[PDB]
Amino acid sequence: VHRVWVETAATAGGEYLKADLGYGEFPELEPIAKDRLHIFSKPMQLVTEKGKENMIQRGTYNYQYRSNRPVKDGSYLVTAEYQPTFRSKNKAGWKQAGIKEMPDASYCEQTRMFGKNIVNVGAESADTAIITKPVGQNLEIVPLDNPANIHVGERFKVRVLFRGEPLPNATVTATFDGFDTSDRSKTHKTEAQAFSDTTDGKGEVDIIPLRQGFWKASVEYKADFPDQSLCQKQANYTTLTFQIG
Amino acid sequence: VHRVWVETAATAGGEYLKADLGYGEFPELEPIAKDRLHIFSKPMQLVTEKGKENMIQRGTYNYQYRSNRPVKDGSYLVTAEYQPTFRSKNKAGWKQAGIKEMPDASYCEQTRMFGKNIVNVGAESADTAIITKPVGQNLEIVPLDNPANIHVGERFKVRVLFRGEPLPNATVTATFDGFDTSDRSKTHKTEAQAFSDTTDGKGEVDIIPLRQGFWKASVEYKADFPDQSLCQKQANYTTLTFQIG
Fold first, then answer.
1. From the CB of residue B56, how many other CB atoms can be counted at a distance below 10 Å?
2. How far apart are CA B238 and CA B203, in angstroms?
3. Cα A59 versus chain centre, distance
4. What are phi and psi of A147, to 5 degrees?
5. How far A119 CA lies from chain B's nearest CA (Å)?
6. Nearest C-alpha neighbor of B83 from the set B43, B53, B112, B110
7. Pfam families from the xrefs (chains A, B) (predicted)?
């Protein structure tokens, strides 16, 4: 199904920062369809020393964004958000494979998705003050180091936060653009991951990349919706994208 | 978090096949503790063209096994089994679900674990007739090729069977000895994985190894116990170990 990630063009100091909203199957960017525009009703955000600022949707396709002004050397974040949507679900009678299951009862589920890209502007930029600060995504991956410092085979430590608190025992997987390309089509999935581990009691996990490239780490979390008088379940899907080498 | 895997020593045609039962944290072999001996009440098995035969538990440590007779060149399996154990469980405590995980209703869960190693006796042995035939583990990983034919970056296809039938949408992860060197401080975590994907409708998945070495693939599956008048849940933990390059 469709997930949210962010991609940024390589950017030097003094040029506009160009970013793409990915909604679909990594790493293929696709225009946001007519029936999905309402889900992305807020622009992607650029996070700098001054805080969060809206990016400007410009380009050929509606997933393309631009910083309002040219950016100087530094290490920044670009964030995207699938705004909360509600749907009915019922677990009616499907899937199975080993459990009897079945419990006819429709319920409301709220879906939220989040993307975050670490972008180093300038060939030697490896700052941490901005990128290691949580931005307040309901489910968030917070890097604890700058990925520019990470060589193949080394440990890239991240922290998973849920509702502001570290989330233990969450599965974080990671893959890179080009890892799984065989027979890719609209009907054939290429979801293979090059890394998987679970977070510790501090919500932390070390991603160990075995190849250079454009990486995406993923975590998901299903929980009860806060106000049970309005909705029952909440599903969160969050990514962190970054370059290795 | 103790899991079952199998290791085999390098073996040439005409000598005895030496194998190790791993119960603990891959890849460190550990003596089977006194209070766990009853779980491994049946010896590891060697699978050849002749079928299954018991191996002989002999050596310095109680996890070491040896073939009854010397083995000739070929491609064989060595299997191990954690015999079914029952435990009481109760559900409680998670991030943002609901404190009341149903006022503590305890239930029985049966745990079973399985290990399988592909062993090529002879430097040019890469046969498939034996190793691709299922041996009947409740949850089983069946290789569809001999790993000796798989180079780094190529696809090693396997099939997951549960109760004799292909298991779709099962998560298969894989790691290798030396990938994750973090010490016994995780005490609740398993080792980091260098691969993760889900099985397709035929229960099949391509493992893509990014490094040479001694690899372990893992799948787990929790389902309803067959006879609900005795126990409620079943947890299965299965590994397949093999050499790449």
1. 15
2. 15
3. 22
4. -60, -20
5. 25
6. B112
7. DUF4198 (PF10670)
